[PDB]
Amino acid sequence: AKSKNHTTHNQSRKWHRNGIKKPRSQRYESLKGVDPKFLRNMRFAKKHNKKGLKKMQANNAKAMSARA
RNA sequence: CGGCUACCCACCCGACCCGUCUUGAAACACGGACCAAGGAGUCUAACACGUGCGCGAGUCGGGGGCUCGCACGAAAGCCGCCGUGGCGCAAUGAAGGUGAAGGCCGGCGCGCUCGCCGGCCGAGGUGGGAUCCCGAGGCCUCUCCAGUCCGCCGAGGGGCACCACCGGCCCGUCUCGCCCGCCGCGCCGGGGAGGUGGAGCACGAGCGCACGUGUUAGGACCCGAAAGAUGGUGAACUAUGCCUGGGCAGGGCGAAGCCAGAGGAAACUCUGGUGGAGGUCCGUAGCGGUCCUGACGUGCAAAUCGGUCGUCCGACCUGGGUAUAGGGGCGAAAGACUAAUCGAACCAUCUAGUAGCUGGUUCCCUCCGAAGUUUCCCUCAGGAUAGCUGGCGCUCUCGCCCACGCAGUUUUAUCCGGUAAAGCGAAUGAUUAGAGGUCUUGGGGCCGAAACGAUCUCAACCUAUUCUCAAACUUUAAAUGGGUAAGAAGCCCGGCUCGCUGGCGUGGAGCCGGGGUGGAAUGCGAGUGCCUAGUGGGCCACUUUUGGUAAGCAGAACUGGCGCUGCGGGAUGAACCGAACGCCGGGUUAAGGCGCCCGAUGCCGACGCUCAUCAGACCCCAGAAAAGGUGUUGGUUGAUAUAGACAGCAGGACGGUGGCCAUGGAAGUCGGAAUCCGCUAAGGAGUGUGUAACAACUCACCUGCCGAAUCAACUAGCCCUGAAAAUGGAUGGCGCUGGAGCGUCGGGCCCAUACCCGGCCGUCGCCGGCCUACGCCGCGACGAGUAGGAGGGCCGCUGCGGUGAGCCUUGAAGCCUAGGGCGCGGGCCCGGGUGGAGCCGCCGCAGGUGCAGAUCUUGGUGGUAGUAGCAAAUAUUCAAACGAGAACUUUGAAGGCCGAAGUGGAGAAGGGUUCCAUGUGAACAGCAGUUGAACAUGGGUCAGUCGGUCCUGAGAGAUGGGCG
RNA sequence: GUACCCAUAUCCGCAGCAGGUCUCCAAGGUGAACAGCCUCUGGCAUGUUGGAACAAUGUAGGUAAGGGAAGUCGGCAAGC
RNA sequence: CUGUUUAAUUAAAACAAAGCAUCGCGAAGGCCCGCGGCGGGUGUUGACGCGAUGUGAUUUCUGCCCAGUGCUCUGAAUGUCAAAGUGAAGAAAUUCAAUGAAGCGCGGGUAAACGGCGGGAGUAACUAUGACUCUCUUAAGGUAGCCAAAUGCCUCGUCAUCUAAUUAGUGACGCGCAUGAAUGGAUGAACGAGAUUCCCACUGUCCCUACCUACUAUCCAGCGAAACCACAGCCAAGGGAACGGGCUUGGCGGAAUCAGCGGGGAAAGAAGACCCUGUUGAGCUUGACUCUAGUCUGGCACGGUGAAGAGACAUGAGAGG
RNA sequence: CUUCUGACCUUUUGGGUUUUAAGCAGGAGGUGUCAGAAAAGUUACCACAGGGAUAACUGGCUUGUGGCGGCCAAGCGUUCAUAGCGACGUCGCUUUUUGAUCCUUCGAUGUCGGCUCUUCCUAUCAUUGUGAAGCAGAAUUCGCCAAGCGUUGGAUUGUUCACCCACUAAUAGGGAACGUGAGCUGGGUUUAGACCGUCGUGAGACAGGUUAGUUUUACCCUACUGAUGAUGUGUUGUUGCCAUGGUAAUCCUGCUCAGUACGAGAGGAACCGCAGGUUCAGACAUUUGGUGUAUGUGCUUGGCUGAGGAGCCAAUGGGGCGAAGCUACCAUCUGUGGGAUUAUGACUGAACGCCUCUAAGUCAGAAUCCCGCCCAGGCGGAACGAUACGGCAGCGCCGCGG
RNA sequence: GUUUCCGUAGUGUAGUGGUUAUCACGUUCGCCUAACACGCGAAAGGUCCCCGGUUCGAAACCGGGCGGAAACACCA
Ligand SMILES: [Mg+2]
Ligand SMILES: [Mg+2]
Ligand SMILES: [Mg+2]
Ligand SMILES: [Mg+2]
Ligand SMILES: [Mg+2]
Ligand SMILES: [Mg+2]
Ligand SMILES: [Mg+2]
Ligand SMILES: [Mg+2]
Ligand SMILES: [Mg+2]
Ligand SMILES: [Mg+2]
Ligand SMILES: [Mg+2]
Ligand SMILES: [Mg+2]
Ligand SMILES: [Mg+2]
Ligand SMILES: [Mg+2]
Ligand SMILES: [Mg+2]
Ligand SMILES: [Mg+2]
Ligand SMILES: [Mg+2]
Ligand SMILES: [Mg+2]
Ligand SMILES: [Mg+2]
Ligand SMILES: [Mg+2]
Ligand SMILES: [Mg+2]
Ligand SMILES: [Mg+2]
Ligand SMILES: [Mg+2]
Ligand SMILES: [Mg+2]
Ligand SMILES: [Mg+2]
Ligand SMILES: [Mg+2]
Ligand SMILES: [Mg+2]
Ligand SMILES: [Mg+2]
Ligand SMILES: [Mg+2]
Ligand SMILES: [Mg+2]
Ligand SMILES: [Mg+2]
Ligand SMILES: [Mg+2]
Ligand SMILES: [Mg+2]
Ligand SMILES: [Mg+2]
Ligand SMILES: [Mg+2]
Ligand SMILES: [Mg+2]
Ligand SMILES: [Mg+2]
Ligand SMILES: [Mg+2]
Ligand SMILES: [Mg+2]
Ligand SMILES: [Mg+2]
Ligand SMILES: [Mg+2]
Ligand SMILES: [Mg+2]
Ligand SMILES: [Mg+2]
Ligand SMILES: [Mg+2]
Ligand SMILES: [Mg+2]
Ligand SMILES: [Mg+2]
Ligand SMILES: [Mg+2]
Ligand SMILES: [Mg+2]
Ligand SMILES: [Mg+2]
Ligand SMILES: [Mg+2]
Ligand SMILES: [Mg+2]
Ligand SMILES: [Mg+2]
Ligand SMILES: [Mg+2]
Ligand SMILES: [Mg+2]
Ligand SMILES: [Mg+2]
Ligand SMILES: [Mg+2]
Ligand SMILES: [Mg+2]
Ligand SMILES: [Mg+2]
Ligand SMILES: [Mg+2]
Ligand SMILES: [Mg+2]
Ligand SMILES: [Mg+2]
Ligand SMILES: [Mg+2]
Ligand SMILES: [Mg+2]
Ligand SMILES: [Mg+2]
Ligand SMILES: [Mg+2]
Ligand SMILES: [Mg+2]
Ligand SMILES: [Mg+2]
Ligand SMILES: [Mg+2]
Ligand SMILES: [Mg+2]
Ligand SMILES: [Mg+2]
Ligand SMILES: [Mg+2]
Ligand SMILES: [Mg+2]
Ligand SMILES: [Mg+2]
Ligand SMILES: [Mg+2]
Ligand SMILES: [Mg+2]
Ligand SMILES: [Mg+2]
Ligand SMILES: [Mg+2]
Ligand SMILES: [Mg+2]
Ligand SMILES: [Mg+2]
Ligand SMILES: [Mg+2]
Ligand SMILES: [Mg+2]
Ligand SMILES: [Mg+2]
Ligand SMILES: [Mg+2]
Ligand SMILES: [Mg+2]
Ligand SMILES: [Mg+2]
Ligand SMILES: [Mg+2]
Ligand SMILES: [Mg+2]
Ligand SMILES: [Mg+2]
Ligand SMILES: [Mg+2]
Ligand SMILES: [Mg+2]
Ligand SMILES: [Mg+2]
Ligand SMILES: [Mg+2]
Ligand SMILES: [Mg+2]
Ligand SMILES: [Mg+2]
Ligand SMILES: [Mg+2]
Ligand SMILES: [Mg+2]
Ligand SMILES: [Mg+2]
Ligand SMILES: [Mg+2]
Ligand SMILES: [Mg+2]
Ligand SMILES: [Mg+2]
Ligand SMILES: [Mg+2]
Ligand SMILES: [Mg+2]
Ligand SMILES: [Mg+2]
Ligand SMILES: [Mg+2]
Ligand SMILES: [Mg+2]
């Protein structure tokens, strides 16, 4: 009652029945898996960007609108 | 006259018998004699998904109650201070428990990696994102002017759903630190910053009903077992006890005991009788069954018969009563017997036990359409998961010098490898041979007391070489192939934040604003979510390969095919070569072919080869080698020849020298080493035959005649030998030789479901119209398919509610039909013939809803087939009679059988009217009857003294008692 | 209770089935014999069919010149 | 030996049998039945009896091993040993310690209990075979007997006889794969429907077949089924699931039949009794796993009275290292 | 599940304290069949659902192995390679052995050997025709055409195989599903009983040995043997042809040849001719031998008809003879010739001045082949006879018209 | 063919839990006897089958050959 053990015949055709897909769409790449010291940099940097960016960027926008 | 058609026949071509296990079925694989009816995915509960409806942060009366008693009312209507309750609106923790809002501005404490006060906004930000909004601009028959008018867009903006990322909040754990409150200042609570686990929040979408698919548990698509348990029934067969009865013809051998005679002193012995002993012998009835492995062997018989058999006074056979009853009995022991069943009986129930295992699974059309593979499992005939597949959608994109994106593809750049090859005078491992050098030791020879005092050779060593290799060697290193980039998600500029980092405003990340899109070729409109069947036994071929001698063997890689697939060639074929399939007409072609089957060369086809007494004839493919040929055809390398060759005919073919090694011989001729001269026209210390040797013959070489082309060795095309197998046989056969063989080709010719054009059906896509909108058109490309999945059916059956002022005894259902027709098909309508009382159409609803199979169930009928068979036991014959009817009934007569252990006369068990008379002969008796045990009617069994009844036998049994 | 069968036709075996089932009576001859054979008392139609012919093969029975087990696994069967 | 047995494939060399043995049991018992009781069988019985086995008449023998597995006897001298009881710690559950019934271990007996019985080397004035000898070795090393046996692979062992010829038979030899002593060994008169060899007579068993008779088979009168059947039946070759009847190419092919025969229809009869799979079973067997009837023990109640003696715990007094 | 570690952790259920128990997080006690059940053997007394997914037969591919050949020739062959042989190497055929695979067969294809019977092959044992030898003759060996005909009787074993005796020309090799079991036999293999030896404690096992062990059916179709038949010539009969199918003859001994050829001998043929014989085939019964139921005749046993006579019964009572007919290699007779040719040997004669059997042509040539002879004669045809009274009839030939 | 075991002075054998050449017989010398047996005192004889690996160190543990020895080879 010996049977056939292992083969890869008729496998690439089944692969190309449905058109093997690149992931092909990653805009704004995922952030997990990155250095926790770098994350302790980046999250505090982002929340202080949210806090203290108003007046200097506002005056710079006024200055570049006056100069351009 | 016309007519397709479920009528019949003939002709040309094609055509193996359906269904399923299988890689493969017409199979010498299995089921099927035929026909009619029945016959197999249902129902409940639960879950998940999709769809339809109602209400909607709610939803639901299924549990009850209320109405007047109603056939439909076992319906329906209502409750609402009947919402108890289920699900959802809140999750996280094992639990104590805890439990989803943040942002902006001003002031205050050292705006201090830091809290408070007052006000405002409010489920955050970024990149895409259908749609929507503002609008430069320009366009309408002659001018200034306007309003709606014809009329879009560059650019900008708010951004649905959803995707991707960042940030925030809640719960349990982890690290670091400080602060706040006191119905009481404590191992009391609460709060902050970070990275983690959650099925969370981040404006909720659920509830109820219905339909469809899938899964689970219930008998669960249908049928199927060896088996297990529970409770009862059998000792009429058989096995063994016990009680009570019956039976066993005749002969042979001659034990004990006894008598008589003789011998002996005694012990005792010898002879002749009598006697009838015995798990004794021949043998019958009886009981069993050795052999013919006889007869039968769909029989007389689910174990019998004919001979030949063993035993037959006994451990013998046998009737009746009784006892032992199923994991029990009983066994002179075979696991044999226990009611045709015994290595665990019979009947019923659990039970429709389970089966990963056989067989079967019921109408049509259309569309799409596999796999025999990864991993896991006590897994290998199975299942789970992933892959392949179908269905349901959603998000977008095109139709008006420029979009987004993708690719079994190429190009331009950039990396990767270690196979094919090649090499080892390059490492590792093997391996061959020669040369040169002289350090070392070992073995021989020489000078000679011995002495690395000296010499030659050998052994090993070194150097330069040289031969052959390595899947588990490699300096080098291909072809093929794999990854990446070819832009608006990109490039540059300016500025903030950082608790990361640090000479530095240093570096790096994030955030904000702005600028210009024409960024390799070709083709294509893309992304994404849910549910799920089947699949998990494969095979073949080119190429690369593993084991084996090889296989139509076993196992791998890429691709294609069969399976899942028709069509044209290969005669026939699963895989080969073309080419893939809706129904047809015309033309053309591939693969192949053009002597006839069998469509096409029947061309005044071309060149050359082949004669085969086994010719040859097209990838797989169905046969053949090493070797050989003065059979023919080319080709290469050579050698001769007028200074007359090859063949032929004729002659010469010596001297030294009978050379030398050899003694049995060599005096050219078995044998080993050699090898020169003279005459020369030429002689080889001799090519062969022969002698034991001596001798003769012939050849190398030379010359006489003839006369100009000849010889040798290789090579490859056809053909031949090599070439032998069993029924008669295969280029397909017939045949074919100036081809119908072989190799090279030219022009025509034939066709497939292949291609092009056109007619028709269907699907899909795009689209038209304010004409059943679920209808009507318009254009274009496509149609094959097992398992499987969907859509449609104005296909069909049964029943229910609406509905047709439906159909009819002037003929409904049903059935038949060489009748007419429709639809592609499921099927349907009408006509004609019997029939006599119910039937149909549309719209919805619910099914015990379609048969070709299952050694399918029931019922009926063929071939066999008027066939086998009416043959165990000696046999019947003549006349008459009743009678329609006599091989069989009855009687007369004759001949036979059974022959007293009967084919006779009566009983027990069992049968129940069969006993007897009369009448009939459709039915019974395997033909027949006037006959019977058949049928119908009527009769028949008389007891104190025959038996039961009475008695106990083996045994069965209730009370007292005990157990339960 | 009293009939009848008590069986190759009244029982059992699916049947008018060469199967099975317990008993008493038993004559003459030959013969040791209740052996086998022929008769008498008593029964019967040959056993669920008849007619014609005598082929193969078969089922039972008997022979065969000479050899006598040489056939066959075995003298199996048959015969002395 | 006579007898019995697989009814329906065996009749025996199988079973039984008398004889020879062994073991248990003196009745509150041996072996058994029963769900139950002091209920039953042996038992209306008592070691010349009952129950359980081995071998199988007579004669002659019963070799040697208790190492192993069984069976039995003995002792609280002695290790282990469960429930119950005793003492201590604590508030208690709980824990600890000693005391220790059977069995096992410790010792002995038993083999007419299951069973077992060795392999090398050197050696004799022809050589071989070998009396004899050294060593390893177990519990004992096959003793008396017998033999290519119904037991011997080599094997058709070697010699002799039987025969023209013998793998057969018989007698003998015996390091005998793997004979052997109640697992009985060796003989043996009588008897085998037991197996085998040879001889005389006898015959169709044959050489070598032939003939006759009875019945059937044949035909006719009457009456008449059954198995089986997708269709239906001419072959050769090719291919195909590798042996076709039907496909292809050939050979060819006239209705309807009867009597035979058995070459085929891979003929029929049965869901292969051989082999393999099933996470399908059933008889069995044991040192498989898990239990249990039965049986042997210990404890608690039924279970009570008197005396003697001992062990352990508690109290105070005295010697004591 | 157990165990240990940690929080001055949570719950121990009406509320507190303590013990205990549970939980939380992570280390350990394992599933070696390693993603993990807790597990001995036999069934020949076996059963069930299945499989040709999977062995034991044949058949199919292959030919290692077995067998049979070839190639170059170191040598054997007194000398000498190839008369006959042939190592070291190498190329093929066959399924008559064995092996390899599992392709068909598991709802069955009956498994060995023997008996009987038919056909085929050649890798030829003999016979016919030939060539070559170390072929003087005889006897052998190697080859070719060649399968037409033969290729035994027996002791042993179940045999396939093998050994032995004797005969002969020779006792050659095989195939047909390892031919043949609805043909047989059942000897062992291969059920159930039983014995011996070994293994296993045991049930049981043993390509170790020995015993007794059911052999089912044809009436269907085709094939084959035999027999009615059928179609066409108008019916029918007689006499004939052969298209086709088969085939039958084979072998040996004795006498002359001749104790001659040949050979020194020992030995020792051949061709023609003549008697026969083995096997086979066809007949036949005059004789001989069987058979016997003319139940023909005649004895005799037991019974029966009263006794003699005449008879009968006993499954044809026994045995002595025996007619007709069947039958025996147990009696007797018969078995027959022409052609083309294979192998081979040649003629003429080139290729190639010569040579040559060949290349075109001619000859001899055999158990091979075909025909003759012998059988049945075709969906084959001939020649000839008679062709329908009766009383009406019916039927042929010629030429007719509708 | 498969799986295990053995090989040591002339013979039978012991022996590593790594670091000997072990016991007896056999040969030879001496004493004892008049002389052989026997006894006593002694000596010689080892490639631990052959070739490699591990370790400082092997015959020893392991790998490959050589020559022997046990068990199986079953179902058809
Ligand atoms: Mg597989
Ligand atoms: Mg299957
Ligand atoms: Mg198959
Ligand atoms: Mg099929
Ligand atoms: Mg079959
Ligand atoms: Mg079939
Ligand atoms: Mg059938
Ligand atoms: Mg129906
Ligand atoms: Mg509520
Ligand atoms: Mg709930
Ligand atoms: Mg069932
Ligand atoms: Mg059970
Ligand atoms: Mg009885
Ligand atoms: Mg009995
Ligand atoms: Mg007697
Ligand atoms: Mg009998
Ligand atoms: Mg018989
Ligand atoms: Mg008798
Ligand atoms: Mg007798
Ligand atoms: Mg007797
Ligand atoms: Mg039971
Ligand atoms: Mg029975
Ligand atoms: Mg059983
Ligand atoms: Mg039972
Ligand atoms: Mg069912
Ligand atoms: Mg698997
Ligand atoms: Mg799809
Ligand atoms: Mg290479
Ligand atoms: Mg499905
Ligand atoms: Mg499968
Ligand atoms: Mg393969
Ligand atoms: Mg295809
Ligand atoms: Mg398939
Ligand atoms: Mg496909
Ligand atoms: Mg074709
Ligand atoms: Mg072909
Ligand atoms: Mg033509
Ligand atoms: Mg083939
Ligand atoms: Mg031909
Ligand atoms: Mg389609
Ligand atoms: Mg139904
Ligand atoms: Mg209904
Ligand atoms: Mg039907
Ligand atoms: Mg069907
Ligand atoms: Mg049926
Ligand atoms: Mg007949
Ligand atoms: Mg009358
Ligand atoms: Mg009479
Ligand atoms: Mg009597
Ligand atoms: Mg009587
Ligand atoms: Mg009557
Ligand atoms: Mg009457
Ligand atoms: Mg009748
Ligand atoms: Mg009546
Ligand atoms: Mg009672
Ligand atoms: Mg009476
Ligand atoms: Mg009767
Ligand atoms: Mg019956
Ligand atoms: Mg008398
Ligand atoms: Mg008398
Ligand atoms: Mg009768
Ligand atoms: Mg005779
Ligand atoms: Mg005679
Ligand atoms: Mg005689
Ligand atoms: Mg014999
Ligand atoms: Mg006899
Ligand atoms: Mg006689
Ligand atoms: Mg018998
Ligand atoms: Mg005795
Ligand atoms: Mg003894
Ligand atoms: Mg206690
Ligand atoms: Mg002891
Ligand atoms: Mg000696
Ligand atoms: Mg002895
Ligand atoms: Mg004999
Ligand atoms: Mg022994
Ligand atoms: Mg025919
Ligand atoms: Mg054929
Ligand atoms: Mg064929
Ligand atoms: Mg064949
Ligand atoms: Mg067929
Ligand atoms: Mg046909
Ligand atoms: Mg066809
Ligand atoms: Mg017939
Ligand atoms: Mg089966
Ligand atoms: Mg399994
Ligand atoms: Mg060979
Ligand atoms: Mg197979
Ligand atoms: Mg059959
Ligand atoms: Mg057959
Ligand atoms: Mg012949
Ligand atoms: Mg055969
Ligand atoms: Mg037999
Ligand atoms: Mg036998
Ligand atoms: Mg047996
Ligand atoms: Mg017998
Ligand atoms: Mg017959
Ligand atoms: Mg002379
Ligand atoms: Mg004759
Ligand atoms: Mg006569
Ligand atoms: Mg008389
Ligand atoms: Mg008289
Ligand atoms: Mg007579
Ligand atoms: Mg006579
Ligand atoms: Mg010639």
mmCIF file of C-alpha atoms (C1' of nucleotides) and ligand atoms in Angstrom, chain B residues 18-21 25-27 29-30, ligand 4:
data_model
loop_
_atom_site.group_PDB
_atom_site.id
_atom_site.type_symbol
_atom_site.label_atom_id
_atom_site.label_comp_id
_atom_site.label_asym_id
_atom_site.label_seq_id
_atom_site.Cartn_x
_atom_site.Cartn_y
_atom_site.Cartn_z
ATOM 1 C "C1'" C B 18 -25.260 1.064 -19.705
ATOM 2 C "C1'" G B 19 -24.085 2.591 -14.002
ATOM 3 C "C1'" U B 20 -19.571 3.287 -10.879
ATOM 4 C "C1'" C B 21 -14.305 1.939 -7.725
ATOM 5 C "C1'" A B 25 -13.609 0.116 -18.747
ATOM 6 C "C1'" A B 26 -16.479 -2.345 -24.287
ATOM 7 C "C1'" A B 27 -13.531 -5.248 -21.039
ATOM 8 C "C1'" A B 29 -13.799 -5.880 -13.214
ATOM 9 C "C1'" C B 30 -18.664 -6.004 -10.644
HETATM 10 MG MG MG G 4 -17.607 1.964 -17.962
#
